[PDB]
């Protein structure tokens, strides 16, 4: 019984190689493309040998042993990866655990900057090399990217270049195709990173809870046993992928996609479109499937979960199953709620039973349990209404700026690039979610907010700067967004010392693209808040407007630098007075 042969036979050579390339790229993010390709081929050649004869020497070793041994043969390991050479002394599974610790969530690699003429040539010159290069580039930038899903995006990446290279207009799919794919890559990466973060920081229990809530919303027709079945299998898939077991992850994901499609009539009417597709496409469509219509025979929950006299007995006899059933029943009923809200509601239900069942007369106590949920629902609904009201009034750029001020005040010790990133991400959430139908706003906003907050938390694990951020990031997954919302200006913070050069602009800003100009100004905005943390958002908006006007004027000037030189220092000095 050869594991590597077993995976090679199940997956096929193409997907086997793709996943192995991705896995290696994620583990060793600094190595060049050619180096990894060689290791992939070496591993694949061995798999073929084992497929021919599974009794052969070393074919019965574990995948982690074989792939771990392979990574440790890389040239200049100690120089390039000083930390990783230490892992190579260790044995499995200790070695892989060491490997996973050293994955870098922020490698700070160059921007993709597609060159359509050169890339279409390389694509035509060698497609396998070209598509493989793409897997490699994204994988090392996103060390926790969902392995099988990255192969799906490589196919979209192929279809773009296939359709557009022979066309007349050279860059007819630059902004249209690659920028859209780039956006989908970011969202997908953020979604999977949350799952891996949940395993790491809160355990498998938290991942299953989240998954029960989400899949109940998606598949309200399905029975609890069906959802539990799917959650169990899907949790194992993500567990394997998050721990670098990409071949096993891909294989189990295929098995799950098959199961769902075989039982689609009892699961969801929306799956039929997904289930008449190829493998990678089918799995992707299932994963992103639209929520099914609510069945007309949804049961009233007051009887079982509020009015039944033996709830304390049920709760005590099997807490997991009873609470699991509640979460399933309440979630399928509420596609208009965010997942974290449903998890908060489930925690409040649990807490109510813990309290009420210790008292003398539990029934009278827990009779009003559903009424405790109302304030939990109103708070996020109010936040989303306020944020969307602001977004629709001022637009994305100014909405981003308001969020940068908001979060810099909460966490002024965090780096400016990180504060700008989260502010800009949460601004795009406005564009994405506030235009949706009204019932879909809350789930879209809060679910995306969870992704952006996790990004901040993951960067904070690497570079801790604030005890308040640690607390919100590690105390409770469900309470994370309310914790961050509750943060106010850190009074313990001492204003960052003034540096004139930080707010000094030059003629180089004028040649930049619009998004890059914004980031420079938004970076200055974060720095303004850091030096003057008590300045109001209204003061800051005005001062930034003056900076924007100053940049606009001097970029339209005959002598651009002389304009920046004369005008800048006065404005820099005057701005500080405006922020008192
Ligand atoms: C997965 C895939 C087939 C297998 C390809 C993969 C691109 C990268 C690659 C390079 C190789 O040298 C082996 C085959 C693989 C792994 C392709 C991208 C789309 C296509 O379906
Ligand atoms: C997270 C949680 C404990 C673990 C529960 C979860 C409901 C769903 C569930 C079902 C299971 O089969 C395992 C335990 C879990 C994952 C509960 C909801 C609130 C409670 O705190």
XYZ file of C-alpha atoms and ligand atoms in Angstrom:
622
model
C 0.000 0.000 0.000
C 1.780 3.091 -1.347
C 0.160 6.400 -0.343
C 1.970 8.346 -3.091
C 0.905 5.781 -5.730
C -2.639 5.814 -4.357
C -2.861 9.622 -4.683
C -1.197 9.568 -8.107
C -3.747 7.046 -9.398
C -6.736 8.892 -7.908
C -5.753 12.421 -8.917
C -4.052 11.827 -12.261
C -0.608 13.077 -13.242
C -1.676 16.620 -14.128
C -3.497 17.443 -10.895
C -0.926 15.477 -8.890
C 1.896 17.642 -10.258
C -0.096 20.872 -9.896
C -0.909 20.213 -6.244
C 2.660 19.125 -5.471
C 3.959 22.320 -7.094
C 1.527 24.413 -5.057
C 2.450 22.626 -1.819
C 6.184 23.167 -2.387
C 5.680 26.818 -3.365
C 3.764 27.449 -0.118
C 6.356 25.741 2.105
C 9.382 27.378 0.423
C 8.177 30.797 -0.756
C 11.580 32.249 -1.799
C 12.863 29.518 -4.173
C 12.831 30.177 -7.946
C 10.291 28.507 -10.262
C 12.868 26.194 -11.898
C 14.037 24.761 -8.548
C 10.491 23.730 -7.568
C 9.694 22.251 -11.003
C 12.698 19.922 -10.606
C 11.451 18.682 -7.211
C 7.925 18.181 -8.587
C 9.292 16.047 -11.442
C 11.502 14.057 -9.049
C 8.531 13.400 -6.736
C 6.285 12.507 -9.690
C 8.859 10.127 -11.202
C 8.958 8.313 -7.852
C 5.148 8.129 -7.718
C 5.131 6.476 -11.169
C 7.727 3.918 -10.029
C 5.583 3.173 -6.969
C 2.440 2.926 -9.115
C 4.205 0.220 -11.156
C 5.442 -1.628 -8.043
C 4.070 -0.619 -4.621
C 6.299 -3.157 -2.823
C 9.368 -1.250 -4.109
C 11.788 0.325 -1.631
C 10.626 3.547 0.099
C 7.228 3.514 -1.701
C 5.450 2.665 1.570
C 6.671 5.829 3.370
C 4.173 8.545 4.321
C 3.539 11.518 2.015
C 4.816 13.891 4.699
C 8.011 11.842 5.021
C 8.546 11.780 1.243
C 7.706 15.446 0.600
C 9.475 16.626 3.758
C 12.597 14.706 2.722
C 12.349 16.361 -0.700
C 12.145 19.927 0.639
C 15.223 19.259 2.795
C 17.341 18.514 -0.318
C 16.943 22.109 -1.582
C 20.214 23.959 -2.241
C 21.368 26.754 0.091
C 18.645 25.907 2.618
C 20.442 27.424 5.631
C 21.316 30.688 3.835
C 17.918 31.367 2.227
C 15.821 29.777 4.995
C 17.855 29.859 8.232
C 14.842 28.807 10.297
C 13.863 25.923 7.989
C 17.213 24.103 8.178
C 16.395 23.447 11.852
C 13.126 21.700 10.893
C 15.034 19.315 8.593
C 16.881 17.725 11.540
C 13.485 16.704 12.972
C 11.388 13.654 12.063
C 7.695 13.522 11.094
C 5.240 14.575 12.258
C 7.383 17.047 14.258
C 9.133 18.250 11.085
C 5.901 19.177 9.271
C 4.703 20.976 12.412
C 7.970 22.959 12.324
C 7.464 23.617 8.589
C 3.926 24.974 9.079
C 5.086 27.396 11.795
C 7.443 29.097 9.322
C 4.937 29.823 6.538
C 5.096 33.580 5.891
C 1.728 35.337 5.499
C 3.473 38.532 4.339
C 6.536 37.795 2.137
C 6.329 41.266 0.495
C 7.010 40.006 -3.038
C 6.766 42.245 -6.140
C 3.419 43.144 -7.702
C 2.332 40.938 -10.595
C 2.420 43.765 -13.174
C 1.290 41.733 -16.190
C 3.033 42.473 -19.488
C 0.504 41.181 -22.071
C 2.880 41.075 -25.083
C 5.635 39.170 -23.242
C 3.222 36.839 -21.414
C 1.220 35.880 -24.531
C 4.550 34.969 -26.154
C 5.606 32.850 -23.152
C 2.131 31.262 -23.042
C 2.400 30.331 -26.732
C 6.068 29.392 -26.229
C 5.352 26.976 -23.352
C 1.813 26.809 -21.826
C 2.564 24.186 -19.138
C 5.488 26.335 -17.985
C 3.307 29.466 -18.135
C 0.340 28.076 -16.172
C 2.739 26.378 -13.738
C 4.463 29.715 -13.199
C 1.070 31.219 -12.258
C 0.361 28.487 -9.669
C 3.844 29.079 -8.254
C 3.485 32.885 -8.056
C 0.109 32.803 -6.275
C 0.977 29.854 -4.005
C 4.111 31.505 -2.547
C 2.175 34.770 -2.068
C -0.704 32.857 -0.450
C 0.859 29.984 1.576
C -2.567 28.808 2.845
C -4.496 29.102 -0.427
C -6.991 26.278 -0.921
C -4.906 23.901 -3.076
C -7.592 22.406 -5.370
C -9.183 25.840 -5.808
C -5.898 27.321 -7.098
C -5.926 24.754 -9.931
C -9.446 25.965 -10.762
C -8.190 29.561 -11.006
C -5.250 28.473 -13.182
C -7.865 27.208 -15.678
C -9.625 30.595 -15.636
C -6.183 32.176 -16.070
C -5.637 29.863 -19.076
C -9.036 30.680 -20.636
C -8.253 34.412 -20.408
C -4.938 34.114 -22.285
C -6.417 31.546 -24.706
C -9.308 33.856 -25.656
C -7.434 37.180 -25.665
C -3.886 36.674 -27.043
C -5.004 36.168 -30.686
C -7.492 39.094 -30.496
C -6.895 42.459 -32.192
C -6.893 44.738 -29.138
C -3.699 43.784 -27.289
C -4.767 44.671 -23.735
C -8.502 43.951 -24.139
C -8.347 41.551 -21.166
C -5.823 43.352 -18.928
C -8.170 45.370 -16.719
C -11.131 43.159 -17.646
C -9.696 39.661 -17.092
C -6.615 39.740 -14.860
C -7.867 42.416 -12.423
C -11.104 40.455 -11.923
C -9.153 37.213 -11.361
C -6.797 39.085 -9.006
C -9.874 40.142 -6.990
C -11.221 36.573 -6.838
C -7.767 35.308 -5.785
C -7.744 37.751 -2.838
C -11.247 36.876 -1.596
C -10.625 33.130 -1.964
C -7.291 33.410 -0.148
C -8.928 35.392 2.680
C -11.760 32.843 3.048
C -9.415 29.855 3.282
C -7.015 31.686 5.627
C -9.903 32.220 8.078
C -10.555 28.467 8.081
C -6.874 27.698 8.725
C -6.731 30.468 11.371
C -9.809 28.961 13.053
C -8.158 25.516 13.240
C -4.915 27.031 14.536
C -6.351 29.473 17.091
C -9.741 27.952 18.045
C -9.667 24.278 16.990
C -11.704 21.926 14.801
C -14.758 22.497 17.020
C -14.917 26.137 15.855
C -14.544 25.189 12.172
C -17.405 22.670 12.392
C -19.658 25.195 14.168
C -19.027 27.832 11.496
C -19.595 25.207 8.790
C -22.880 23.928 10.289
C -24.247 27.486 10.302
C -23.125 28.319 6.751
C -24.174 25.021 5.144
C -27.575 25.092 6.875
C -28.135 28.546 5.323
C -27.075 27.172 1.922
C -28.973 23.862 2.161
C -32.144 24.531 4.208
C -33.937 21.537 2.589
C -31.281 19.122 3.891
C -31.691 17.104 7.105
C -29.420 17.650 10.124
C -27.797 14.241 9.544
C -27.082 15.260 5.934
C -25.562 18.608 6.969
C -23.556 16.923 9.761
C -22.278 14.354 7.250
C -21.172 17.111 4.852
C -19.680 19.278 7.633
C -17.652 16.322 8.970
C -16.244 15.570 5.506
C -15.646 19.215 4.536
C -13.899 19.899 7.857
C -11.484 17.015 7.220
C -10.803 18.401 3.729
C -9.886 21.877 5.002
C -7.945 20.389 7.935
C -5.767 18.453 5.485
C -5.303 21.436 3.129
C -4.444 23.805 6.030
C -1.788 21.331 7.240
C -0.139 20.978 3.825
C -1.674 17.583 2.956
C -2.825 18.859 -0.451
C -3.053 15.525 -2.301
C -5.240 13.961 0.397
C -7.232 17.198 0.607
C -7.867 17.249 -3.152
C -8.837 13.568 -3.166
C -11.313 13.920 -0.281
C -12.772 17.089 -1.841
C -13.500 15.120 -5.032
C -15.162 12.380 -2.967
C -17.339 15.017 -1.246
C -18.349 16.694 -4.530
C -19.432 13.279 -5.833
C -21.452 12.561 -2.685
C -23.234 15.933 -2.759
C -24.163 15.468 -6.432
C -25.369 11.883 -5.869
C -27.665 13.147 -3.073
C -28.525 16.537 -4.623
C -32.311 15.960 -4.665
C -32.365 15.740 -0.851
C -29.783 18.538 -0.350
C -30.562 21.470 -2.669
C -32.322 22.315 -5.938
C -29.539 24.805 -6.761
C -26.891 22.061 -7.143
C -28.094 20.743 -10.534
C -26.161 23.374 -12.512
C -22.992 22.679 -10.499
C -23.287 18.902 -10.776
C -23.312 18.888 -14.606
C -19.762 20.327 -14.753
C -16.146 19.035 -14.794
C -14.349 18.155 -11.531
C -12.655 21.435 -10.511
C -15.613 23.457 -11.838
C -18.161 21.259 -10.022
C -16.373 21.584 -6.666
C -16.020 25.358 -7.081
C -19.706 25.754 -8.005
C -20.797 23.702 -4.966
C -18.511 25.750 -2.697
C -19.973 29.036 -4.019
C -23.537 27.746 -4.527
C -26.499 30.079 -4.057
C -28.682 29.497 -0.999
C -31.739 27.326 -1.658
C -35.319 28.519 -1.184
C -36.749 27.957 2.298
C -38.994 24.876 2.442
C -42.650 25.447 3.361
C -42.541 22.745 6.081
C -39.919 24.470 8.282
C -40.844 23.539 11.871
C -41.715 25.979 14.653
C -38.787 26.021 17.094
C -40.531 27.349 20.227
C -41.823 23.865 21.113
C -38.503 21.984 21.052
C -36.105 24.767 22.104
C -38.149 27.027 24.446
C -41.347 25.326 25.695
C -40.353 21.647 26.122
C -40.132 20.704 29.815
C -37.187 18.289 29.408
C -34.765 20.701 27.663
C -32.334 20.565 30.600
C -32.327 16.758 30.333
C -31.675 16.875 26.563
C -29.010 19.553 27.031
C -27.236 17.562 29.770
C -27.477 14.169 28.005
C -25.938 15.415 24.735
C -24.909 19.082 24.586
C -23.107 18.870 21.217
C -26.047 17.249 19.408
C -28.746 19.405 21.044
C -26.878 22.682 20.425
C -25.853 21.438 16.972
C -29.502 20.807 16.099
C -30.433 24.294 17.339
C -27.701 25.966 15.272
C -28.817 23.967 12.209
C -32.503 24.859 12.686
C -31.924 28.566 13.390
C -29.341 28.994 10.608
C -31.394 27.357 7.814
C -34.195 29.762 8.784
C -31.892 32.813 8.665
C -29.939 33.326 5.411
C -30.326 37.063 6.169
C -27.905 36.680 9.137
C -24.106 36.575 9.131
C -22.426 33.333 10.218
C -20.724 34.931 13.247
C -24.095 36.361 14.372
C -25.593 32.850 14.256
C -22.639 31.565 16.301
C -23.200 34.375 18.832
C -26.910 33.468 18.978
C -25.976 29.802 19.553
C -23.582 30.807 22.358
C -26.342 32.902 23.985
C -28.732 29.943 23.774
C -26.120 27.696 25.434
C -25.438 30.332 28.106
C -29.170 30.679 28.834
C -29.530 26.911 29.359
C -26.391 26.748 31.549
C -27.913 29.419 33.809
C -31.586 28.390 33.753
C -30.978 24.656 34.330
C -28.989 25.385 37.521
C -31.954 27.317 38.995
C -34.981 25.892 40.846
C -37.540 26.328 38.029
C -35.772 26.097 34.623
C -38.863 26.143 32.325
C -39.974 29.614 33.492
C -36.369 30.824 33.091
C -35.637 29.593 29.528
C -39.198 30.299 28.272
C -37.967 33.679 26.960
C -34.693 32.382 25.443
C -35.451 33.525 21.864
C -36.059 37.092 23.099
C -32.393 37.341 24.187
C -31.410 37.158 20.493
C -33.108 40.448 19.520
C -30.342 42.788 20.802
C -27.719 40.567 19.109
C -29.488 41.001 15.748
C -30.125 44.755 16.033
C -26.493 45.767 16.743
C -24.938 44.465 13.490
C -28.003 45.549 11.445
C -27.528 49.081 12.777
C -23.778 49.053 12.025
C -24.330 47.881 8.427
C -27.062 50.497 7.857
C -24.814 53.297 9.167
C -21.814 52.120 7.119
C -23.854 51.733 3.911
C -25.488 55.144 4.491
C -22.002 56.658 4.716
C -20.673 54.708 1.704
C -23.566 55.758 -0.547
C -23.188 59.411 0.508
C -19.408 59.863 0.167
C -18.272 56.996 -2.101
C -15.513 54.405 -1.800
C -12.389 56.588 -1.443
C -13.813 58.753 1.359
C -15.433 55.704 2.990
C -12.032 53.964 3.005
C -10.552 57.107 4.583
C -13.184 57.130 7.347
C -12.373 53.473 8.131
C -8.613 54.182 8.117
C -9.201 56.923 10.712
C -11.546 54.615 12.647
C -9.080 51.697 12.828
C -5.888 53.773 13.242
C -7.498 55.259 16.370
C -8.280 51.721 17.610
C -4.773 50.423 16.858
C -2.269 53.256 16.251
C 0.684 50.920 16.982
C -0.113 48.893 13.836
C 1.976 49.639 10.734
C 0.672 52.197 8.223
C 0.672 49.704 5.310
C -1.472 47.315 7.408
C -3.921 50.037 8.508
C -4.286 51.248 4.899
C -4.791 47.651 3.691
C -7.653 46.911 6.113
C -9.223 50.344 5.565
C -9.145 49.860 1.794
C -10.430 46.268 2.014
C -13.373 47.286 4.231
C -14.124 50.147 1.833
C -14.437 47.656 -1.036
C -16.837 45.655 1.165
C -19.071 48.742 0.986
C -18.981 48.657 -2.822
C -19.622 44.903 -2.839
C -22.347 44.614 -0.189
C -24.288 47.899 0.032
C -25.633 47.605 -3.546
C -27.073 44.122 -2.854
C -30.727 43.492 -1.956
C -31.452 44.734 1.565
C -31.789 41.298 3.218
C -28.349 40.255 1.906
C -26.430 43.286 3.196
C -25.824 42.069 6.736
C -24.440 38.647 5.786
C -22.263 40.123 3.012
C -20.888 42.902 5.231
C -20.191 40.914 8.411
C -18.871 37.814 6.617
C -16.408 39.962 4.625
C -15.548 41.966 7.752
C -14.544 38.675 9.429
C -12.099 38.040 6.567
C -10.508 41.506 6.833
C -10.269 41.279 10.634
C -8.586 37.866 10.379
C -6.018 39.318 7.958
C -5.186 41.932 10.611
C -5.024 39.255 13.334
C -2.773 36.994 11.234
C -0.348 39.879 10.614
C -0.549 40.631 14.355
C 0.572 37.069 15.230
C 3.730 37.736 13.213
C 4.195 41.299 14.486
C 2.414 41.923 17.790
C 2.086 45.614 18.655
C -1.130 45.998 20.704
C -2.547 44.104 23.682
C -6.077 45.174 22.713
C -5.644 43.606 19.262
C -4.316 40.375 20.814
C -7.386 40.207 23.065
C -9.943 40.715 20.267
C -8.037 38.329 17.968
C -7.664 35.461 20.469
C -10.546 35.644 22.980
C -13.473 34.387 20.903
C -13.947 33.825 17.207
C -17.668 34.622 17.343
C -17.198 37.825 19.389
C -14.291 39.088 17.241
C -16.194 41.720 15.210
C -18.106 43.158 18.214
C -14.781 43.262 20.120
C -13.145 45.291 17.344
C -16.219 47.542 17.035
C -16.120 48.235 20.789
C -12.510 49.466 20.638
C -11.997 53.204 20.947
C -8.991 55.489 20.709
C -6.185 54.027 22.773
C -5.583 56.642 25.476
C -2.471 54.747 26.593
C -0.972 55.547 23.194
C 1.552 58.387 23.064
C 1.400 60.375 19.827
C 3.964 59.465 17.225
C 6.727 62.052 16.986
C 6.289 64.500 14.113
C 8.359 63.919 10.971
C 7.895 66.499 8.194
C 9.241 64.127 5.505
C 6.286 61.757 6.073
C 3.844 64.450 4.859
C 6.141 65.857 2.136
C 5.023 65.020 -1.416
C 7.074 65.276 -4.622
C 6.521 65.246 -8.408
C 6.877 61.430 -8.575
C 3.302 61.025 -7.246
C 1.853 62.554 -10.450
C 2.990 59.732 -12.756
C 1.378 57.027 -10.587
C -1.930 55.307 -11.410
C -5.017 56.448 -9.484
C -5.084 53.582 -6.952
C -1.402 54.120 -6.107
C -1.877 57.879 -5.651
C -4.743 57.160 -3.239
C -2.590 54.804 -1.186
C 0.111 57.472 -0.795
C -2.487 59.976 0.445
C -4.212 57.348 2.605
C -0.821 56.417 4.084
C -0.317 60.087 5.014
C -3.834 60.109 6.513
C -2.953 57.181 8.791
C 0.220 59.034 9.821
C -1.765 62.224 10.529
C -3.963 60.237 12.925
C -0.885 58.703 14.589
C 0.610 62.140 15.328
C -2.760 63.730 16.245
C -4.922 60.860 17.599
C -7.545 63.110 19.244
C -8.255 65.049 16.023
C -11.809 64.396 14.808
C -12.574 62.569 11.556
C -14.024 65.868 10.281
C -10.756 67.737 10.965
C -8.814 64.934 9.249
C -11.077 64.860 6.181
C -10.609 68.623 5.700
C -6.822 68.477 6.113
C -6.598 65.540 3.669
C -8.758 67.472 1.192
C -6.208 70.300 1.362
C -3.402 67.796 0.676
C -5.351 66.306 -2.264
C -5.964 69.763 -3.763
C -2.285 70.654 -3.301
C -1.222 67.440 -5.089
C -3.786 68.017 -7.861
C -2.523 71.569 -8.467
C 1.232 70.894 -8.478
C 0.778 67.844 -10.742
C -0.896 70.156 -13.291
C 1.946 72.686 -12.957
C 4.551 73.599 -15.589
C 7.350 73.216 -13.033
C 5.910 70.434 -10.878
C 8.721 70.118 -8.317
C 9.063 73.873 -7.719
C 5.334 73.820 -6.921
C 5.703 70.947 -4.430
C 8.769 72.662 -2.919
C 7.166 76.091 -2.403
C 3.675 74.920 -1.438
C 4.308 71.729 0.571
C 6.092 73.002 3.700
C 3.492 75.706 4.449
C 0.675 73.180 4.132
C 2.552 70.632 6.245
C 3.016 73.185 9.030
C -0.500 74.654 8.720
C -2.115 71.187 8.759
C -0.820 70.443 12.289
C -2.634 73.536 13.617
C -5.844 72.294 11.993
C -5.589 68.995 13.918
C -5.353 70.472 17.435
C -4.168 21.673 -14.038
C -3.693 21.907 -15.484
C -3.082 20.627 -16.066
C -1.749 20.260 -15.408
C -0.727 21.407 -15.400
C -1.319 22.719 -14.863
C -0.318 23.862 -15.030
C 1.015 23.549 -14.359
C 1.573 22.226 -14.789
C 2.847 22.120 -15.190
C 3.528 20.856 -15.398
O 4.697 20.805 -15.761
C 2.728 19.625 -15.148
C 1.255 19.848 -15.480
C 0.627 21.032 -14.723
C 0.444 20.652 -13.239
C -2.629 23.015 -15.601
C -3.409 24.299 -15.293
C -4.809 24.033 -15.882
C -4.817 22.559 -16.310
O -6.109 21.968 -16.141
C -19.424 26.090 19.254
C -20.444 25.300 20.096
C -19.806 24.026 20.661
C -19.481 23.006 19.568
C -20.668 22.666 18.650
C -21.382 23.921 18.122
C -22.643 23.528 17.354
C -22.317 22.588 16.199
C -21.530 21.389 16.647
C -21.883 20.157 16.251
C -21.064 18.974 16.454
O -21.420 17.870 16.061
C -19.767 19.175 17.163
C -19.852 20.330 18.158
C -20.305 21.655 17.518
C -19.180 22.191 16.609
C -21.686 24.864 19.292
C -22.438 26.181 19.043
C -22.139 27.032 20.293
C -21.119 26.233 21.116
O -20.227 27.096 21.827
